[PDB]
Design a protein around this ligand. Sequence first.
Ligand SMILES: [Cl-]
Ligand SMILES: [Cl-]
Ligand SMILES: [Cl-]
Ligand SMILES: [Cl-]
Ligand SMILES: [Cl-]
Ligand SMILES: [Cl-]
Lengths: 195, 195, 195
Amino acid sequence: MNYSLEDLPNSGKNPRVYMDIVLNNEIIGRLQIKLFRDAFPAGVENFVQLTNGKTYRNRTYEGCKFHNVLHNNYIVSGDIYSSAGTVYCDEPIPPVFGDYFYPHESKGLLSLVPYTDESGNRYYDSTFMITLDDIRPSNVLDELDRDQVVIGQVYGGLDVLDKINSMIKPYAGRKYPTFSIGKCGAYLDSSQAQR
Amino acid sequence: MNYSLEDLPNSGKNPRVYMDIVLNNEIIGRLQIKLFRDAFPAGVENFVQLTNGKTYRNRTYEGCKFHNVLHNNYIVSGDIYSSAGTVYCDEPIPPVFGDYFYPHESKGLLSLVPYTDESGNRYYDSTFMITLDDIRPSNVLDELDRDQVVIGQVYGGLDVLDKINSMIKPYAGRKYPTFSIGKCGAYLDSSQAQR
Amino acid sequence: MNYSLEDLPNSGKNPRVYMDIVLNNEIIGRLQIKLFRDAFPAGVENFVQLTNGKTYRNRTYEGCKFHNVLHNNYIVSGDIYSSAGTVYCDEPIPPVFGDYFYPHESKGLLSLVPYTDESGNRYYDSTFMITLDDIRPSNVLDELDRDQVVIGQVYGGLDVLDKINSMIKPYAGRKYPTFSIGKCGAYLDSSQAQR
Ligand SMILES: [Cl-]
Ligand SMILES: [Cl-]
Ligand SMILES: [Cl-]
Ligand SMILES: [Cl-]
Ligand SMILES: [Cl-]
Ligand SMILES: [Cl-]
């Protein structure tokens, strides 16, 4: 499978998904994430289908490393190949947002990380960010571009985010541990599934 | 071939060279660069002969990655092996400059990046920088060391520099694409070539 | 062999050890380091036994790269596997310090770099730092955490530290050379050895 941007799958209004977080071949915890398809339909569907991992070239978040990590701020992942992609024949995802916007001020928010092409145009891919804290004077979450678009929230596993954040407390000369995504998937969306 | 620092080749007063810029196995554009041999004879000759790629251990810029890149500032390349070298049996190039100096204030200037040896002495190699913009308050080009010595200018392909610069617009968590040098070479210098 | 944290070996009050510093397959100099076992018994013993390299999984500093380096400040090494470890079946080393504390203000001090586990608890491993200068307004050694615990001093080879520091003088676009540890070992401790 691939999907078309012209004819988007529909995974539900609020798909829910999970991701194990792995460190040194051991699962340290599981994140459970509720998505807001009305924030950004194409970016939400790409996230959910990559979580399902059935799309083929197989495209999954499983095995992805957290490649940019910042104590008291965020973690970032999504290099599904090292590079990022999309379920839409790896087509860039346009910034076509839905009817609602979610502020980017709280701990455990999921967002998609923008990039700019050769013409200066904004696109999205599999690259995603999760916040480790709320905005406060002591961090730089208030500095994130509005284009760092919120598409979901963690509803289980904030304590796993805390473990990650503790382990990345900075010290000169200390390199961070390498976190990765383990098993991942979507929970059944019963409203979408019923017949 | 190798060359000798005591007996420098002469590629012309203003050799002209080209470099394709590659991203993801596709050529995104070509830079055409005019060099100022009177700025720095040995550093100019090393640049030009590496562009020709006929010197052997084969020493070419072809395939080199742009390893340090900074939005609104510069791109840097020259790791011809990952490390840098020279056509002079890989001897360091001394800071023996020519009769003229070129200011380092404009977009599309080519320069050689200095390094310091165990004794604190300055040398140059295949490592080179191209500016992505003019000096302005919003960038840090005015902070470059005088030792970041200008040896040339881009006379074709500034629009390729613009494409690069757009694609490296920073966003927290976004890793930059990897640019590299494709085919490269020197144009015939007709004054040097005529008989 | 492994060692036990409950039953620590004793390498002497002030074990002395050496490390060759290698750059490009050539030895550039040797560091000779005197340790203060009374600063931190378990962290000192781990350092000394890794220097001996007889402990097995073989655990040695020999071949380790200097992975974090900062001009006019410090160099850092200790990734004995790329990751760090300990001679105590790779158990974390607790912050159980000895009777004395050594200030962290001078050139050529050896220290152990802390890390934080998932619970926010501090531990140490094979990761170690050597200072390249004294504290001064122009550097950031005064910013080091008190947890960057001094366990020794260089008593021979400060001139080797100078060579390293010169070669890492920063220039935009210049990547640093890669330094590593060559042969290493402990000198006989005659008070411990006599019978
Ligand atoms: Cl579950
Ligand atoms: Cl620190
Ligand atoms: Cl051409
Ligand atoms: Cl941002
Ligand atoms: Cl010796
Ligand atoms: Cl500089």
